[PDB]
Amino acid sequence: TFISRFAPDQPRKGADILVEALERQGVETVFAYPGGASMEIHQALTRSSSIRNVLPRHEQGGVFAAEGYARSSGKPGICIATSGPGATNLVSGLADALLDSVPLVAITGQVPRRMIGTDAFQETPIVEVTRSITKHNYLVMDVEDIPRIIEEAFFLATSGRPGPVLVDVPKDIQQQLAIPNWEQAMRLPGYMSRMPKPPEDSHLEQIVRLISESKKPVLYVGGGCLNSSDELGRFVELTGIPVASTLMGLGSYPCDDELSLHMLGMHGTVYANYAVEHSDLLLAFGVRFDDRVTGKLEAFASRAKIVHIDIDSAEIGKNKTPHVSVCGDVKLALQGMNKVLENRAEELKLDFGVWRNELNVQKQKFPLSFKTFGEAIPPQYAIKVLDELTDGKAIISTGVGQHQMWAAQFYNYKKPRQWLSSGGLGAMGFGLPAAIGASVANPDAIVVDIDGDGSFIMNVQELATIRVENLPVKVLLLNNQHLGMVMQWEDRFYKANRAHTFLGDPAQEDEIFPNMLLFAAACGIPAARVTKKADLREAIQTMLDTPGPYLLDVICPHQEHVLPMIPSGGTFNDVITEGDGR
Amino acid sequence: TFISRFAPDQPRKGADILVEALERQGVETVFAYPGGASMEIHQALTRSSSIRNVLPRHEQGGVFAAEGYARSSGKPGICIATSGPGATNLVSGLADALLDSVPLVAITGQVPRRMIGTDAFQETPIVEVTRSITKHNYLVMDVEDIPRIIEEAFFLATSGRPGPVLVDVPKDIQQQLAIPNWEQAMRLPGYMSRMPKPPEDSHLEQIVRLISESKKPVLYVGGGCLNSSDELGRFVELTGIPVASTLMGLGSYPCDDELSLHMLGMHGTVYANYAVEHSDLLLAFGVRFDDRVTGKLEAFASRAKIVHIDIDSAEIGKNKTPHVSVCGDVKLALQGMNKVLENRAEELKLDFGVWRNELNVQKQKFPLSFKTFGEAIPPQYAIKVLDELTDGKAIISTGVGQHQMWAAQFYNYKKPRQWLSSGGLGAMGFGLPAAIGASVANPDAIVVDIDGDGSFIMNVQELATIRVENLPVKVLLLNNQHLGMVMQWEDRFYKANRAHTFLGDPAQEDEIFPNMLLFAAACGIPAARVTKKADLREAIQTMLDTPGPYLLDVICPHQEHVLPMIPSGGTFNDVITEGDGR
Amino acid sequence: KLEAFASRAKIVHIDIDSAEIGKNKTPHVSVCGDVKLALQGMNKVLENRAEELKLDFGVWRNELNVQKQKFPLSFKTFGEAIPPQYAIKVLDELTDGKAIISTGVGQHQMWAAQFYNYKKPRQWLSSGGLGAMGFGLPAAIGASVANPDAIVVDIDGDGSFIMNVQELATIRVENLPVKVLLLNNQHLGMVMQWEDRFYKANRAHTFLGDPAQEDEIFPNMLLFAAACGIPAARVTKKADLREAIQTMLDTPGPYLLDVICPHQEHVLPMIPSGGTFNDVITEGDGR
Ligand SMILES: Cc1cc2nc3c(=O)[nH]c(=O)nc-3n(C[C@H](O)[C@H](O)[C@H](O)COP(=O)(O)OP(=O)(O)OC[C@H]3O[C@@H](n4cnc5c(N)ncnc54)[C@H](O)[C@@H]3O)c2cc1C
Ligand SMILES: Cc1cc2nc3c(=O)[nH]c(=O)nc-3n(C[C@H](O)[C@H](O)[C@H](O)COP(=O)(O)OP(=O)(O)OC[C@H]3O[C@@H](n4cnc5c(N)ncnc54)[C@H](O)[C@@H]3O)c2cc1C
Ligand SMILES: CCCOc1nn(C(=O)NS(=O)(=O)c2ccccc2C(=O)OC)c(=O)n1C
Ligand SMILES: CCCOc1nn(C(=O)NS(=O)(=O)c2ccccc2C(=O)OC)c(=O)n1C
């Protein structure tokens, strides 16, 4: 039974109604940057003893933190911003959450209702702007609609295929006195009627039939399996089917496991892409057949019967047409199939040992590899050392680029929601704020931001947030003084012609610029720099052992190329296994 | 006669066509951050020997720099971004340019045409997102449309009421070989038919008639007069009518001049607001009657015949209904009236000396003022010292907040386009990037960013840009360890109840956090901190005399309130003249 | 009710629009493409493996034939009054099922779909998704222009017919051999039917005649045709119906036959909106 700070017959500001509405949703943390149109809400937050605000230094840092909070917990991330420039600063975060299907509730303050449309002070039509980059949005036009809309916003953001929901609240609504009704019904008749039914036995039995008739099955696992860790593991035990994950599905199945084919796709392992290429049965669970994964669609799993289980019916048949499909929760589908696979285990002598052996040969002949040049630090090796010293139990947020791929390749995530990374949009400056949200959601966990020097500096101001909030965020900065991935594409497609990809100072080429150690020192965060590979292990150990925030500046050669690589729109036969920028 | 780097019959990439299109517009500088969807464009830029790229460390820094470039020169600002996260990072800048009517051309890369709408890698529907926050936007669907669209984009951005125009260019279009036609006609028949005619003598004579029949005339000057400095000055000489400017119109008429009433509005001078309040003739030239200026509309210039000259017909009669209006260029209107006022000078014995004397009494009894507490540095005084040491000839960019108002109040701008500030949207983090664009456009000028500690840290990463580009940008940081303006509103409307407005470290309250000196040192930028008022003059002098970039950290008391203040939606009788947070 | 529709069946869906596959019901097997090409591909397989696949659904077909025997399409004949179902059945016989049929929307639309056996596609022209009244007569015009040598008949209701009655002028001017079989019940039939079953037969603006002269047929559709120089006639007795339709067909050029029908007729059988097969209604009218 919920307890309000107000009497049931006592009028109160809309802002106080809005905050209590969040309290009734179980919200414990918000990421809010104060402004004129949202001052009432901020005043109401201070009256709440259950909701804590983490003040960012930029709204983009705020919304990215809410994403990290959401991705690392499964809870919806909540960020609050003011009108105008505050609201527009959320846009990259909203788009990011929509593409990666992250549950997010964003509340923006707005000018008074009568002032809307008059080009008023700090006014943007944020609902118009964000309509195409959110799952849904609202413009509250009356104080009595606040309880209903907030409830609908959280329901829409967390149910079905998760996504961002924005609620725009005019300032006069926040100031109006009213008595809220919490027993009101949601106005979502269309959405609720299209909510997927629990998976029928008819479809589940069809899948099990295909499994027993296959000889080269492959699991194609993605972000939709992040809540099905136990069920997926049980499924693999009963079938023995090897598992290949997407960038978004890392950790759903243990990467260090014997049946793990690791990541597939453009920068996936050779044996993972091989498995899909030669499979006769593709079990696509919680994926959306992205172009980074498939390449040329007609060549992707061309010899396989495709099974697709997605909670979004619009995804089923979008890029590739499945022979068998299930529209519903993959968690429930796995549970249903596990019961059948267990009761008919003796009847179904499932043994794909020959197929698994064939893949093990590919894993032996084409493993993930890297070179060690003298005493220079291989970024791949640095991440591998972090894995060992954290025992693969750390929460890892990254930026976007070469370091992002290496963090996905050379760290073996044992559980889901350890891996926090911008996949669909691929937004730089995501790593540091996401680590903040993750550390807030997981106070006792080891949180490490594996970042690049280009992505790190984009939201470097959030270092202030980290110190003020006393968050034990570790920053493993892989510094190559360049925009790595773009530089890599320059080497292969533009004859290594440099077009604004150097991030240092041309006046002092060999000097590391900027000095990231001084950024950390500015915010009272202890830092160090390692250059020699021999000193790397002790340096990372120091970063972990030192209580509180820490920045380790790891200097890396910029000639490194991410391998292997399947060219955009290419096939498995177009895979590149050797080459760099030397 | 323009000279191309290609033969008239030689096929070339769309990216090369796009860059030459910019060259034919006289573009010398762009602000571009490279990404996959815009790599072709960046490759094409390196082949250009006339166009220089300033690489920012964040796209928001890039677009804000393009604004500073535009505001300080009158030329269109050009920024280029990649698809997805790059494009969404421009949004705050686009909205900012639209509200302040700043000429801006933003070019974004886009995924291949066939890939659009499929939730592809790094894809955002940027045209949908930015439709309501740009003057116009385009999606190029064929390489042959590039010359026409680019020409239209620059025409729309710079003609009539200036504004931002976004052009989205799919990657396959950039790669396609074609022979461009530069002799093609623009498809803007509606827009060009609605372009205001040159002002008729009929309307101009009506205004002159009103002037000769008035006894208390006041000039209400805004951003529309930024190109009419000479004409406005001539007008004032012939009439003797006192001048009151908006936040956007500072410098159009010399602030240090005898007939200058300085700024009016919410934080305008008492005598400026008094003049408008008791005027019988209000000459509204290049303004839009914003709520920051008028307050309660029915009380604004209630006893005055209102003359409104605006190039946007949609602005004439929007908030207040004018008795006399002219839809056209205020520059041309001034020229027409000056000829009449000169030829009929003896006939029209214009003398508003009695009215001017009445205002001089108000200027004597209610001047701009501030207190000096011990050795603590008054921010108002710091800005006043900067004025003296730069002889009022410096280019000033600011953030948003208390320091923004003091920079507008206590610096006397002698010419237009010295004052660069976000007025309509009021976006924080604008100051530093805008100074960058201004310094690029004006290499020999004194560029100073008067910033607050909250606004400064938002785009602090652009310090790297400043050092790399070797720009003589001076940073006058007014550090009060708080969000000043919000804190001020807390004191007056919420019983000084603090709601996340402290920017320092609560663990070390008296320690200045963060250490901004170390941010500058990280980017190799010389810096210093002044705390005692006695040492302030020498410190600012050092900042100016030291060649290259410089950061001066000025410590200020956070108890200061911006005065005078007319409450939002209030009248002149509601003006507040005394009070702070002590 | 979707959950009850083909609940015991494995569903195969072949559609050229991928957005349709899985929209309402989730298929076990699907093909996104031209059904014409899919049929061609399957026919080759079904022919080459005919001996291997001893396909025989004779038992299932026999089970359905029993249902076809016990629950066939039916109608009553009251005295000499003309059953609309019968009128359409006579048209079928006299045109040998080779005529192009356009209709309006309502009861007559359903009877035209039930009691005429179309032998080829594109004989049946009717507004299905939107169900727009006033469609019949103009559609017949377009059909007659596209098919100059065909027998084009507009089976219309008095409500739908009058909505675009002005196109009678078009028919005469263009000299199109459009036949109009007007089923006149003086009411909006289908709405009237729903009134009888869901609103206790409470009439809410469903009568199309003149309340001052209830038993007089209003309006006089014969005079609409005469206004546009189109030969017309009216039949009331069922005995005279066969000769009347024959006259309509044999008379060269446009023709309007005004068939007077009892308004108490209900379209059967009927499954209520959002209902299941067990909710099917087989008997009842408005008498
Ligand atoms: C620089 C860079 C390189 C990249 N290269 C690669 C690469 O090499 N390999 C790679 O895989 N990715 C790569 N990506 C990431 C890629 O762009 C996509 O983010 C990713 O491939 C798509 O993830 P997904 O297919 O698992 O589906 P997601 O984006 O994670 O979406 C989840 C899907 O499952 C469904 N779903 C959600 N919940 C449920 C549920 N409970 N039950 C059933 N279904 C559910 C959803 O409807 C959705 O369709 C890269 C990204 C970047 C920035
Ligand atoms: C914290 C803060 C406090 C503020 N307080 C104040 C304040 O106290 N006082 C104040 O004045 N502002 C204040 N503002 C700024 C305010 O919000 C607006 O930006 C400003 O008042 C509007 O400027 P403007 O009226 O001159 O018109 P602008 O926004 O500058 O637009 C120019 C107008 O002139 C027209 N125009 C353009 N070119 C021409 C031409 N060639 N010929 C004719 N017409 C043309 C345009 O159509 C347009 O209508 C504040 C902003 C902030 C962030
Ligand atoms: C220098 C003064 C600017 O500072 C502020 N102005 N301000 C307000 O002006 N608040 S307000 O309700 O009356 C308002 C009125 C009209 C248009 C917009 C607003 C608005 O909500 O802007 C945030 C407001 O809330 N703050 C903090
Ligand atoms: C780790 C690989 C990601 O790096 C890159 N991918 N990439 C591309 O993939 N370029 S691309 O034309 O073929 C493309 C194809 C499909 C969808 C989107 C795009 C696109 O333009 O994204 C920028 C591209 O241009 N870069 C730099």
Ligand SMILES: Cc1ncc(Cn2c(C)c(CCOP(=O)(O)OP(=O)(O)O)sc2=O)c(N)n1
């Ligand atoms: C905001 C933004 N801008 C541009 C890009 C495009 N982009 C860019 C510019 C990358 C380089 C990132 O540089 P980094 O130093 O942070 O990391 P790496 O050196 O490991 O690549 S990665 C990539 O795809 C992006 N994803 N997001």
Ligand SMILES: Cc1ncc(Cn2c(C)c(CCOP(=O)(O)OP(=O)(O)O)sc2=O)c(N)n1
């Ligand atoms: C991006 C953004 N967020 C919030 C606001 C709202 N806002 C905020 C938070 C201000 C305080 C600025 O703090 P500062 O330290 O930079 O400057 P002052 O201390 O002089 O006010 S000013 C103001 O109106 C804004 N204008 N822009």
Ligand SMILES: Cc1ncc(Cn2c(C)c(CCOP(=O)(O)OP(=O)(O)O)sc2=O)c(N)n1
């Ligand atoms: C233009 C329009 N209005 C209303 C309807 C709704 N409606 C109406 C009013 C029908 C009655 C049609 O009357 P009718 O005389 O033409 O045919 P029947 O008597 O055989 O029903 S059928 C039906 O569903 C419609 N389909 N189209």
Ligand SMILES: [K+]
């Ligand atoms: K930043």
Ligand SMILES: [Mg+2]
């Ligand atoms: Mg790098």
Ligand SMILES: [Mg+2]
């Ligand atoms: Mg401050």
Ligand SMILES: [Mg+2]
């Ligand atoms: Mg009828």
